[PDB]
């Protein structure tokens, strides 16, 4: 019936939850790296349909894995910002 | 029955028909509607609802070229109004909406509300308009969710599988994980408490269980504004025993701050009152901010201010009226000619109890938040008038690919002369324009 001696009453906070892998947007495109890139955000083809097409880094960066890849078929150093094949 | 089985007969009926249809809609909805106001907005968008639809049950007796007028300046009516920006129309009925799922409405009944949003969604299968009115109407139930003007929880669930039937798709897929989200946001700040009472820490805590995902996606929910804080020992323990639950749950959003889920915490402190008299978020953060100092000046809140006024305004405003504050000044913070002491009066009903008012205000509020939608407009504006022109010409250059682009678009506003980079990067990833040996700049158009 008070809050005027020193009290703690009910009296609280709010909590939250996120995460650490970006993974350095898939240099072939220009769209987002895990709203995956451009081309295959435009492909709209067959996978599993949240986090099969996300990925790893082991250093904190990577591409797609083809990104990198297309860039290193087409010229051996990373594509875009020297990062995973993968 | 001539001039439909003079099949040539018809086009003249079906044209005056879609001439009334839409001159009607824009009449009895659009131009009845005079206060604007989503009561008599979606009223009168019931009235003209009502009568093409019953007009066509006589004599009109089908003849789907009469439904073709019927449909075609129906959803002509549909997204012109006479705002331009016809989005808020359905986000009229969803501020509607708000009035049809906000509990503290009315009393009524399943699909007693449930069906007149039946024909609302009815008409909104006409709507393109939907994605900001998603992004809207979904922070405006997000809220009510918060403040518990949500009509029916399951009742407002089954609503919206209904929608993504014909609706918006994944937002909703995102509202079934916040509802779950929350559900278990308590039941999990239980377990915390089926394994935080556990006498190791954690000793007469309880002072909150505000709980989300921590932010970097794109929700109708945001902790409101704050800064540092005492934040007692308890909810150090709340954050930290939930990332330890949660952290073992998942990483990368985590307990993260959210004052709008703050609210008022002035109990049998120990007061002569009897009273306790919860306050809104910042009304918590404010009254924390005049506690112990028996009155305090716009200096001494200026000390640990690190934010923004409007809380404090409100702060002296209800407790005043309520008369909690031995104020100077309900300003926005507060005069330096004013000050703060906590008053012992009350005026509502119980022990002192209905003083729980935030202003709960936008008009200032509206405004800042239609900024994020002009934003998302012009970006898919300029990504379609982007594509078209890397197409057309492969420009195509980096630098002197971003000047012409520059070059076209004169007229609409300053752009970033970096992220000329990104621009092109855009349009690489869509399979729309490649990247050539040639150059960081000049690289080649592709597909």
């Given at each position: ?10 009296w609280?906070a ?18 987002h790296?895990?709203d995956?890139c ?8 067959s996978?599993?349909?949240e986090?099969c ?6 250093c ?9 890849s ?10 875009l ?6 | 029955?001539l001039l ?11 044209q ?7 001159d ?27 009568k ?8 009109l007796?089908?003849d ?6 019927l449909?075609?300046?129906l ?17 009229l009925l969803?501020?509607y ?7 503290s409405?009315?009393?009524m ?14 008409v ?6 939907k ?18 003007l ?10 919206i ?5 014909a609706c ?34 954690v000793?007469?805590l309880g ?6 995902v921590?932010q970097?996606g ?19 323990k ?8 949660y ?11 959210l004052?709008y889920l ?28 005049f506690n ?6 716009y200096k ?6 690190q ?17 909690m504050?031995?104020?100077?000044s ?5 005069d ?8 012992m ?10 003083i729980?008012?935030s ?5 200032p ?5 239609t ?10 504006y ?11 010409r492969?420009?195509?250059?980096h ?6 682009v ?5 007229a ?11 621009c ?10 490649e ?8 690289y080649?158009?592709v597909?």
């Amino acid at each position: 019936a008070k809050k005027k001696r020193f009290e703690v009453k009910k009296w609280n906070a709010v909590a939250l939850w996120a995460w650490d892998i970006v993974v350095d947007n898939c240099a072939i495109c220009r769209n987002h790296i895990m709203d995956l890139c451009i081309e295959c955000q435009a492909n709209q083809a067959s996978a599993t349909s949240e986090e099969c097409t996300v990925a790893w880094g082991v250093c904190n960066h990577a591409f797609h894995f083809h990104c990198i890849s297309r860039w290193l078929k087409t010229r051996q150093v990373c594509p875009l910002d020297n990062r995973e094949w993968e | 029955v001539l001039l439909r089985a003079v099949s040539t007969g018809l086009p003249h009926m079906i044209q005056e028909l879609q001439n009334h249809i839409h001159d009607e809609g824009l009449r009895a909805t659009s131009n009845l509607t005079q206060e604007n106001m989503p009561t008599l907005f979606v009223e009168s968008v019931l009235e003209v609802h009502g009568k093409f639809v019953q007009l066509i049950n006589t004599v009109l007796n089908g003849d789907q070229h009469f439904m073709s007028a019927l449909d075609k300046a129906l959803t002509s009516v549909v997204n012109y109004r006479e705002p331009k920006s016809v989005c808020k129309a359905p986000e009229l009925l969803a501020k509607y909406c708000d009035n049809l799922l906000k509990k503290s409405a009315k009393g009524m009944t399943e699909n007693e509300v449930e069906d007149r949003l039946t024909s609302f969604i009815t008409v909104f299968k006409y709507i393109d308009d939907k994605d900001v009115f998603q992004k809207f109407y979904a922070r405006m139930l997000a809220k009510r969710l918060i403040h518990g003007l949500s009509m029916s929880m399951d009742s407002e669930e089954a609503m919206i599988n209904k929608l993504k039937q014909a609706c918006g798709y994944e937002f909703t897929s995102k509202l079934h994980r916040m509802y779950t989200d929350m559900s278990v946001s308590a039941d999990l700040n239980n377990k915390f408490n089926n394994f935080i009472k556990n006498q190791d820490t954690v000793i007469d805590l309880g002072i909150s269980f505000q709980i989300y995902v921590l932010q970097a996606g794109a929700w109708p929910l945001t902790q409101a504004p704050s800064s540092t804080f005492a934040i007692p020992q308890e909810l150090e323990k709340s954050v930290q025993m939930f990332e330890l639950f949660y952290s073992q749950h998942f990483s990368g959003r985590k307990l993260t701050w959210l004052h709008y889920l703050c609210t008022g915490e002035v109990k049998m402190n120990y007061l002569g009152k009897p009273y306790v008299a919860m306050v809104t978020t910042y009304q918590m953060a404010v009254l924390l901010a005049f506690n112990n100092s028996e009155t305090v000046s716009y200096k001494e809140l200026q000390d640990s201010t690190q934010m923004n006024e409007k809380e404090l305004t409100k702060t002296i405003k209800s407790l005043l009226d309520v008369k909690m504050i031995n104020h100077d000044s309900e300003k926005e913070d507060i005069d330096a000619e004013s000050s703060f002491s906590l008053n012992m009066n009350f005026s509502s009903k119980r022990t002192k109890f209905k003083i729980t008012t935030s202003m709960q205000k936008d008009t200032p509020q509206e405004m800042e938040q239609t900024r994020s939608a002009v934003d998302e407009d012009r970006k898919m504006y300029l990504q379609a008038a982007i594509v078209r022109i890397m197409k057309a010409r492969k420009v195509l250059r980096h630098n002197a690919l971003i000047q012409e682009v520059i070059s076209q678009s004169r007229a609409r506003f300053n752009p970033s002369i970096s992220m000329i980079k990104k621009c092109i990067e855009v349009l690489i990833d869509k399979q729309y324009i490649e990247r050539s040996q040639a150059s960081a700049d000049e690289y080649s158009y592709v597909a």
